[model samples]
Target chain A: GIHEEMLKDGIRTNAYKNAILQNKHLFKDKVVLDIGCGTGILCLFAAKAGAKRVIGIDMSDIIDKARQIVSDNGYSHVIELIKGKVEDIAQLPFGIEKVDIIISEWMGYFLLYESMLQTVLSARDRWLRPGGYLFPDKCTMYICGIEDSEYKRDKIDFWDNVYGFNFSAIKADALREPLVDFVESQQIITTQSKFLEIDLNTIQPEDLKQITTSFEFTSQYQEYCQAFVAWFDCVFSRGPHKPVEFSTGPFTEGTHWKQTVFYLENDLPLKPNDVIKGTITISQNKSNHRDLDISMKYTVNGGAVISQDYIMR
Target chain B: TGIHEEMLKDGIRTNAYKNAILQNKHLFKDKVVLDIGCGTGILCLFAAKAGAKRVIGIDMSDIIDKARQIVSDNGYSHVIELIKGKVEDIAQLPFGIEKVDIIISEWMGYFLLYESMLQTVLSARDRWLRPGGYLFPDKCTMYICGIEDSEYKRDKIDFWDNVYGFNFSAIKADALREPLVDFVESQQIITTQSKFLEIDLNTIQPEDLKQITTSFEFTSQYQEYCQAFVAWFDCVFSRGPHKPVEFSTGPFTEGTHWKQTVFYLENDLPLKPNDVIKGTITISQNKSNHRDLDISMKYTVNGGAVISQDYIMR
Candidate 1:
């Protein structure tokens, strides 16, 4: 289940638990609204933190299991589950026009693909009180170069001679699509750089319509760079809970949202201390709203530039 | 070629055939080896290297273009030939040969029968393989056991009941009607394994595979919850019977491309030590689509109410 993938991510689920439960002072005796609430877990957590009433809304069929889970967990009276999109629903239960807190798990891989930010923002604009808080108010994206020669050979280069035949046709399509996989910390070939940052409360859908940033990476070793990797860190800094944080970066334990890998058309060999500067732009595909069109160009030690465009779906 | 690469990369599958043929090199001497669905000619190459007097790699895919090229590239043009077209369509063998001495093919699919190539291979065997001719991977035994896969079943099946707050029970039935192609770890298999079917490629007929209903009995190893049944098959390759090479697509061995197929029960059965589970697993080819398989599992635990579930694999 896509739902199981997220729930089993202990690092992600536990971080939310700490951010919400550990801040009982701010969480007690207030109404909490959960958007995109799969399995109604966030609502249960809010109820555990002494919320007077809990509201969880999800457009997926998973909300059916949420209702049973809430009733089974003996929180039927406290937590309420609703089906249908936030954009379609108008009123909250019991004529409660506003909520004191809005919490949700909205980030997808690379913090954007299939993201629920649009729906979560709608819930905030419609029901959240003026002084209400979002459990995760900020997100930061990072980029780094990695050495993945063997995986590249198996995953990409093998297409060149598949069972002693030319099948480079498939290899071309494979290169244009980004891979989602876990990256080892030792594979890091360059320093990590912040590429983008997002504020949930202030960020508009247009701000995410297109994002452009530049990075400068200095090779730490005389090794070949196979791909560029991306990850994100989420911050829950609403109350005096010391700002709970979790990362999907290689340095941390693996999360379900594994690093997104952008494979170069060909591996770039660099000497120690070589600088590779690159500009990357990601735009939502007008043809397919769910796809991201990313274009990148980089130069190695002031050498000739190499450019590539990729689709992340 | 993507699936071809995956098949070729499966060292366990390829090496077993290699050792089965090349390791018993004497049997292949002067023997004509026929590869029925030789996509990349990997098996045909092994047969040639095994000293087969002649090798034929036949298939309908455009892959045969490169296979013939590979045969000549490896300087075996005179010894090996690859023909393009279906076996049933071929009126006669090349080189005026009437029959082959060996038939080798990888025909098993998920659950040993779902969309399998058995029927076509059976047709090739009756028409091409000579009397007492051998089949590489001539024997296959299918095994079934109960697995304590609660969490995964919850994710794969239970999650369908209420996906994010809607009742998609309509869709849940279809999910149950299709077996899950998944890798079940050995630890998840909490019941003793039972043999359900043993197929001998040399003797089994195409009609035998049209429908099969085999009974199985498994006893739990410990106190656990039986959430699903996982099945695997082991294949035996033998041109000569003096100790044949065998490979298993089971959790006890390193994983293979043909991972075990899982069938989730509509509900969990809480089991205690030595609890007995008895069932009949029936697999029949769909009447409408010859390539599709219709499957059903009916069972009970410790004389509990009978439970039956039907599935379709296309």
Candidate 2:
């Protein structure tokens, strides 16, 4: 079901394909590594792009169907499926060595929590030759304020009166937990602020223990800043030149990676050009590292302050 | 069919009730007994074996058809009378029975309140139990304690962080909010259990079950993070304290199908040794349905700010 959903997202699947097919000059006769190669679609694409040998690695049973698909596509001879994780690959009999390129689709929502970037980076460090390439090598995250009076009231406020019961206590959880919804452009009330970026090729897993960033947002109009929303974009670098690109930002078409919204406990009424500056920190939860803890602090005109923490479980 | 296997196989549960009825021959001699929500009519047979003059077993399920066969096979066709009907629907016991001297039922649900079969048992007690009548397993006590659930929560709860590599966390919030009914290892317990609600089936009214509130404080000798709270309940077959037989569906005790219920907090609380995690728990029958319960808690750890959360158990 997850593979079907991911394959059906044309905005995401096509971008990676377009970037691979257009950059055949890089893949020609090169050894490539594909991590989490579900359905082996990317492996097949890499084979078509003239890669000499492509090792598609996955730990799920989807790899069984992927092997069949690879064979059926007449590229099984070039693409090999390894049923394991990256850390255990050295012991497996895949006959793999240092690779010229590591092409992986490893971004997750907000570019972090569900992310396999850590695995991808480890793969890069273990196999990628000196000065090897990474498709979608750079990733960036941005935050903007939204005046979501309609939705915030319908969702967060509705919890306060559950069929005429005083369920106001649960509304705190409603406020603290971020919502993964398709936020629209019209709902944005502040200028988009670029907050964090990760260069996948060079960043270490330890360096990601806590990803901290600062932001300053200028109000585009006089409206209440009810919540903060975030989205991310990945860059497929071909050279120090033109690169293939796609984004899950509000200005772009929607993908499966929908925007994340964090509603504030109190709304800040703002005027045009008023700035709200804040620092946001993201870390893996101590109890469960797969879960992410996000903390944000912001002020309106450097006066009204609101600081809160949310868990993306 | 599914619940019959769980109930019949629970030795601590089944044997305790069996011993409670079969041992007290003097109390049950020449008595008219009623078995509420009697699934397999096993209790009816026990009451009949304990020398009850008549044992009327009533259930709303189709299992009564099978139980009728069980009655004949045991040659209890005359001593045990089976009625396939709801307690709310039955006007009187069959075979000219006016009132029962003892009402026996295995109506405990998960965490003592989930299925709420006890409400019907209470109503049946009001209708069929005579004055000075006895209720086997007359009291149920629910308990609360803090637990450290690192590995299990990571797999069952935090795996929602990446469902095959996509942020399916909208489901995660609901998962964390909902109560988890599963086995918690004895080593997971981080605090001493605090008894919260003691339900006396004899004296507790149906209206009293509509809203219940109690305060609890839990502490331990070890320092660890309290990631979640675990709940379990014990049942007392209070013929007498020393004379009574009981069973516990808790972490440290023998396993039962109704494993401990767990509620994972929105944020983990780190506790020093002997630091108190104090809270008030309110469990109410959700007005939306008679059986559904809304369990909410307000708590603080080591003098921290109070955090409140609500969970629904249907």
Candidate 3:
């Protein structure tokens, strides 16, 4: 799906291409490393950027296809592929003391679900030179209240009367799992709030053990708040040139990441200037380390607090 | 992981099994049921929920651990008993049950027999099923036809001819070896469908499926170039009190995980509205791995050009 998605996601591919192609000076006589390098597209970009040596590492079956792709693109001389964990980079065929730059696209749903940032962080701490850079060093998550009654009706309510049969059991599960879909900007009912931000250059792996982000949103107009939408953007810090960035947020053109929506069981009526305060906590599931368990508690206009839990599987 | 992928697509397969079981509650009431390869114990839950006095689910995989948890979570621990072993060794186990009144299993794979688990289902039928018991889906039919697949050719085959200014044609040969499981529109089919085989579970012996050789002749419904041969299968539950309940995993109906399979030809054939495609297909289990298949297609168009290919589905 990643290969299929990468080909279909023009915005995502072009954004990474621009970030690498425009920053060629940084890669001119340097060694570049790519983490989770599916299909080795980033390695190709680094090779095209005139890098002295580029190493792409992945642990998926797609690595086999990437090897063929590397040769097909005529970059076999510059790009050396490794099919293993980045933590074991020193033991790979393309062994090196350190790399001048590290690049990866490891973001997942709500910015952290199924994220490979841990591998990127491990590589950064292990093999990145003292002054080396990490592409898209900054990631910020934004959440907003949305008036999504129409979609809620279609996705949840419609399940109650599915083909003249009661399928409310499925509806119950749908409410517990966040839906990954495109959300229109006009559906936003509250001014967005930046809930969390992380700088890849300085963040530690232990810092991700527990995440707590608080937000205060004020409704722009009187509408029913039915869901909370989250999206993120990536920023690359280029010393003297303008920094390159792209967004998967609803305010911009949709990318494959789209947005994550957590629909509530019932709608909350709000008026102009009605404030909604909440905190969201996300942690890895104990039984399945790869899955996420997210909990949220919120209050509307100082009313009774409502709490909900969701799992990202 | 494959089982989870199929389970995640529950709307297609799970609902079909659930509907078949629930619509025939009278058959399960006060009856003992056996479910083979019961991943996640979903069928056991359905059987227990439908008033089965006792349901025995057998599977020899790590997924059975999750199924135990699911059974406990659904409060069906008392009604559904899970056995974590192969069904062939059931008689040696201490499961204190000799026979069952009904056997329910979702054994259909790609093209209805890719995994060849129907053999295990039949083993349980001969060893554990009572004289006059029920098989959840008593019948299955395999259908074959030709279609104009220029779109599939462009995406899956020709796309390899050019990959971002380089040649990756080597990948096409590997891609062609694996049948493409995808949904095809009914309108794209240029030839009439022909039923090649039917298996009645109530009477089918395991040896009956050792090898199947069938010939089919399809006349083109319209003037079009045929690029590939597509196949799909249907399942029917005829023992129910109501009218026979059937579902088709074919292009003419709603899609399933077992979508229509495409076997592309090295060369496309131009066909007139009445041009006939007469061919024979042979399916048998691989000697080394029973789960895999050795399929061969030998066909000729209008008794002029002959084409043949042998493929391994592993």
Candidate 4:
């Protein structure tokens, strides 16, 4: 019901419209690319902005829906949807040479968790023209420590019950273990390397491993972590004018995958001297597949400990 | 209903209370006892410890399974027995066992009068008591006071009067009769005897059971005329642990779950800014576990606007 509402009212179109308008010079008369283009909204926008051609690629049943939408709106000649994954799009019969701009919404909260960025990057390397732009072009992962949360409440409850009498002697150890896995637990990080500036159209299946990513708590926590929340800041474009700034956290109203938290067993308050750090490893599963691997650890000055590891497709 | 909250409140584990009672081993060595509302038979097990030769527990529900488990657990099967019937209707019982020497029951309700299960204990006493037999609680009483609290005053008088005066303004006086009658008759207001007339349970007579009535009128601030009366008694049984002075409406026996009568008034008159209620209540022992409580009162601030109610604590 919600997705239908999004599609029928062109809300997704408006989102891409905002992105394109923020980067108008990037698309005007310049060839553009749309990766994982579900409804071809970005592709149609690129075309409307007078791009040389807007090539949309996706590997979903909704490719037919995108076709219908593009045809009904009379943008078929300008925008085209390839019914396959980004890695396989170059092999499509009707795909053309290159594009000046790349647009996509592969950006999900906590970024690499979904592993879709692999496809977006793949399209960039295989299809983008030189000096092309990526909508939500540069994304950053932000992490911050929170105090006084469910993590602390549960920590206190466990200590009070596990022993006949509550003990504060091991408070530090009790707090650290949960904090380690709090952020990394159940996450679907793609293990992809954090991107530095690179040419999208020149990237290849083998060139993907160049991206590296890391996260560490900024300060020593006096108490254990209550919760860790993160958001993304995307540089939509640095147009012929000033770039438009957009962030998912306080900037946008809110998104469904805003945050996730793992409450610790004991309710020990977190002040400072606690450290949370993790690294994401993204590499090729095979020629066309991507694999994600992640490992994280947390520690407290009082010698408390918490750690976790995860890897997903 | 044997769900989470009940289990939490009444856990089967040997907690603090169980240890305290068990430490008093001398109280349980061969006595004939009647356990009122013998819930899961925990108390019956204690009776077996007290050396109760024949422990016959009478409860209205079929909780015999739990009772049997406790009885069988400590090898108390020989002495402890449970009856799966109401203590009120002795006829529902097997025609045997002429009398009991001691009666033990946890009969305290929210206010100690809601279920009025005390009447069942009274029945047990009249029909099942042996000469010199002892009621666990030898005596009981209830006391009322006009304390300095604006909350209770407003809730009782101002709240009720407002309900009748404003909400039910049209033809309310006519509609009030049946409800008032139900409210009045459902509670036993008066009966007799014992001493301590300051309590509502001391001087009411059981013979005037059906003729009991109660009414109150306001006289002055912090002082109103009270007609205190009762239907509670001095229980006499042949056996028990010790003689405990009990009050059905006090903090001693389990508090009353519901009051037999709640005196309400809606007259909003600011009193001496302190305590402003004057009242008296009486409770008299009825046939067995039954009791009648009568309360009469008048407020000092509100002139002569008074009310009284009675309750049959069974």
Residues B160-238, candidate 4, lDDT per residue (tens digit)? Answer: 2322111212222222221111112212222111232221212223344333333222223333222222222222212
> Which consecutive 10 residues in model 3 chain B have the weakest lDDT in total?
B1-10
Worst 10 residues of 4 chain B by lDDT: B177-186
Per-chain TM-score of chain B, candidate 1?
A: 0.96
TM-score of chain B of 2: 0.96
What is the C-alpha lDDT profile of model 2 across A1-313, one tens digit per residue? 4765676576888888888877778788998888888877788778888999998889887788777667766787899888987778774245566888887878877778788888999888888889888887988888999999998887678644432224343456667778888998999988888999889768888999888889988997878878999999888865324577888888888898889998888888889999889999999899988888999988888886689889887
Q: What's the TM-score of each model vs. the native?
A: 0.70, 0.53, 0.84, 0.39
Tens digits of per-residue lDDT for model 1 on A1-313?
5766776687998898889888888899999999888877778789988999999988888888778777766788999888988888878878889999998998987888878877788788888888689988899888989999988888888766644445554577678878899999999989887878888778777776788888887898988899999999999966645889999999989889999999998888878899888888988888999888889988998899899999886
**In model 3, what lDDT does residue A95 have?**
51
Interface RMSD for every prediction, one decimal? Answer: 8.4, 19.7, 6.5, 24.3
So what's the TM-score on candidate 2? 0.53
- Model 3 has an lDDT value of 0.82
Interface RMSD of 2: 19.7
Worst 10 residues of 3 chain A by lDDT: A160-169
Tell me which residue pairs clash in candidate 3: none
Off by over 4 Å in 3: A91-95, A148-175, A184-186, A251-253, B1-31, B35-97, B115-117, B163-167, B207-215, B239-242, B282-296, B308-314
How much is A309 displaced in model 3, in angstroms?
2.5
Q: Note the B-chain TM-score for every model.
A: 0.96, 0.96, 0.91, 0.57
Question: Residue by residue across B159-181, what tens digits does model 1's lDDT show?
Answer: 65653333434446666777888
**For residue B91, what is the lDDT in candidate 1?**
85
